[PDB]
Amino acid sequence: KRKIIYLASPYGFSQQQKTLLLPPIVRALEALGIEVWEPFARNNWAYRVAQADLQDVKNCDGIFAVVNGTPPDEGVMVELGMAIALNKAIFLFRDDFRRCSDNERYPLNLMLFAGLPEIGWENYYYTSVDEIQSHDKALYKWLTGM
Amino acid sequence: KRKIIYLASPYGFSQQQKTLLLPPIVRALEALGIEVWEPFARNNQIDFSQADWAYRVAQADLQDVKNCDGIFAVVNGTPPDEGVMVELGMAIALNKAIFLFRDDFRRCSDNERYPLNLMLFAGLPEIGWENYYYTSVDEIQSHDKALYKWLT
Amino acid sequence: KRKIIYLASPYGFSQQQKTLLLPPIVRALEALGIEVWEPFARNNQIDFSQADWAYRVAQADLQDVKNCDGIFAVVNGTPPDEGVMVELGMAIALNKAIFLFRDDFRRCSDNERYPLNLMLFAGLPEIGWENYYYTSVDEIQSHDKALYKWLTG
Amino acid sequence: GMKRKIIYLASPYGFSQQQKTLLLPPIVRALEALGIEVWEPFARNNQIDFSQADWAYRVAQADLQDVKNCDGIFAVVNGTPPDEGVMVELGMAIALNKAIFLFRDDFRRCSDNERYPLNLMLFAGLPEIGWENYYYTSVDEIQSHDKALYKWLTGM
Ligand SMILES: *[C@@H]1O[C@H](CO)[C@@H](O)C1(F)F
Ligand SMILES: *[C@@H]1O[C@H](CO)[C@@H](O)C1(F)F
Ligand SMILES: *[C@@H]1O[C@H](CO)[C@@H](O)C1(F)F
Ligand SMILES: *[C@H]1O[C@H](CO)[C@@H](O)C1(F)F
């Protein structure tokens, strides 16, 4: 019943970030009725962690990729490319106001948006935790069939 | 028929790097008998992409990754280029052959097994993934390394 | 007069990081009696800077680094923030006290001695640089590390 | 006439075998064609590979000493973001009142402001108006006499 979101991020790498940033994002996602697979939580060797994370990406319904930073985290980027090729739902989160881009259309490297529509890709692009609950944005719509 | 290799790199972004670093790498790959898809040339991303061409560039690079036989991924830098990494993840998800290239001697990893983020090797064997990891341009020709063996 | 620490970080660029990550660090520094200059709030860089403002922001942060007594440099990230590093270099050249913060467990270096690019430690002593290298917000108040000894001694 | 000013050539290019070999020498040549004494730190201070623990402090102080003693920095600020070691060096250069020249032939933007293509602090030691003259976007452009490096050499 619950849609499953793989929450890809670099926030597990920093003690303070793991503790303070991830839980509010998880709460906002769960308040939408989503089942959240957060990889740092679900983990707790290197090869087993990689295949574990690979299996989760294969089996999610959508990825919600935290793409903060200059540049976005390379592991998130790989997990995002996996998700595009496997036709998962794609949602992007960036509340970083810096622009690190190769083009005028997008605020980031244009490949991050190759799995998103030409028009209305911004409906999938979240710029604040406050925005996740929005019924006018693609996450809510995708959960309600629209 | 030549096996198709998509050469993913961030080298088309710098004029000097485009001109000096990519052609030698393209050559060593064509010397194995490979057909090389180099996306900055192939799909003409030569400058800061205009708003009305960014989508076409993106969909063109994506289609080459679907249609190649393997990715040769230049993973220099701290960290590896994000577009390269999207393209590499596509490759892994689509079961393409995977070849990694890094002649950068800096060590940036989240784990002590691999010299980079463990997720970059997810598409490579647990044992002998080093055979797929090239550390120098002259190493591409090596007859004991996975690219030559991949052409059998 | 309180000792002045310039809190250099990339955390002001992210809405959530600004709101949740900086205040706890600010408080850990103030608990030692430090006057904390946090440049995003001080010099009002709260979004993508308008062109007519970018130079004034740069001179204000540059002045603040000149007028501080030491820098507390958040050097999380791969690689560390470039603005933080310009500011750190200024701090080194100006013989400010230097303290580095990184609670990111990834190691990202060009040498086997230091966990980061060795230039970041060029203003730190040859032996005992780890006393200037904090790896947790909790560790900041260590009555045994270089920041506490700097305030007191 | 033109003076034999010392440029410290800060770059990430010595980290990559192929970049050390093909990318730096043409930049060194372009600078030397202007009559400059080039201090390229990878070659000058022997940073060849992943430095040994017992060698890393000397590399650091040697790069640092060279930035203290140069007349100007030529900073290759390619990449997203620019290299952190180059940036520390550019920080020291700004604070020591050294001459500042920026090289970026990377067409991507990684910036926090609309005025500059990079973090606005990279330009803090550059003038408010006319900073473009200190900003080089091609190896060919380095020897132009209408740009700030040429003029810095002639003008006292
Ligand atoms: C595919 O690889 C390069 C590196 O970002 C870009 O052309 C691409 F187009 F995205
Ligand atoms: C100096 O302090 C913060 C760190 O990015 C920015 O304003 C700065 F402006 F770079
Ligand atoms: C000093 O270290 C930095 C790393 O970027 C290089 O520029 C150096 F010269 F070694
Ligand atoms: C999958 O890769 C990235 C590393 O950033 C994390 O999201 C993971 F779980 F390890």
Numbering used by the authors:
A (entry chain D): 2 to 45, 54 to 155
B (entry chain C): 2 to 153
C (entry chain B): 2 to 154
D (entry chain A): 0 to 155
What does the paper behind this entry write?
Here, we characterize the structure and function of a thermophilic dNDT, the protein from Chroococcidiopsis thermalis (CtNDT). Nucleoside 2′-deoxyribosyltransferase (dNDT) enzymes catalyze transglycosylation via a covalent 2′-deoxyribosylated enzyme intermediate with retention of configuration, having applications in the biocatalytic synthesis of 2′-deoxynucleoside analogues in a single step. The reaction catalyzed by dNDT proceeds via a ping-pong mechanism, with the formation of a 2′-deoxyribosyl-enzyme intermediate covalently linked to an active-site glutamate.13 Transglycosylation occurs in a stereospecific manner, preserving the anomeric carbon in the β configuration in the newly formed 2′-deoxyribonucleoside. As with other NDT enzymes, the active site of CtNDT is formed by residues from two monomers, and therefore, it is only fully formed in the dimer/tetramer.
Prior work with the LhNDT13 trapped a 2′-deoxy-2′-fluoro-ribosyl intermediate upon incubation with a 2′-deoxy-2′-fluoro-β-d-arabinofuranosyladenine substrate, and it was hypothesized that 2′-fluoro-containing substrates undergo slower hydrolysis in comparison to compounds lacking fluorine on position 2′. We report a structure of a 2-difluoro-2-deoxy-ribosylated CtNDT after cocrystallization with Gemcitabine for comparison with the ribosylated enzyme. Figure S17 shows a comparison between ribosylated and 2-difluoro-2-deoxy-ribosylated CtNDT. The main difference is in the conformation sampled by the 3′-OH of the 2-difluoro-2-deoxy-ribosylated intermediate, positioned closer to S10 than to D62. After the ligand was added to the protein, refinement (with Phenix Refine) produced three monomers with a covalently modified E88 and one with a covalent modification on D62. We do not have additional biochemical evidence for the formation of a covalent intermediate with D62, and because this could be an artifact, we have not discussed this in detail.
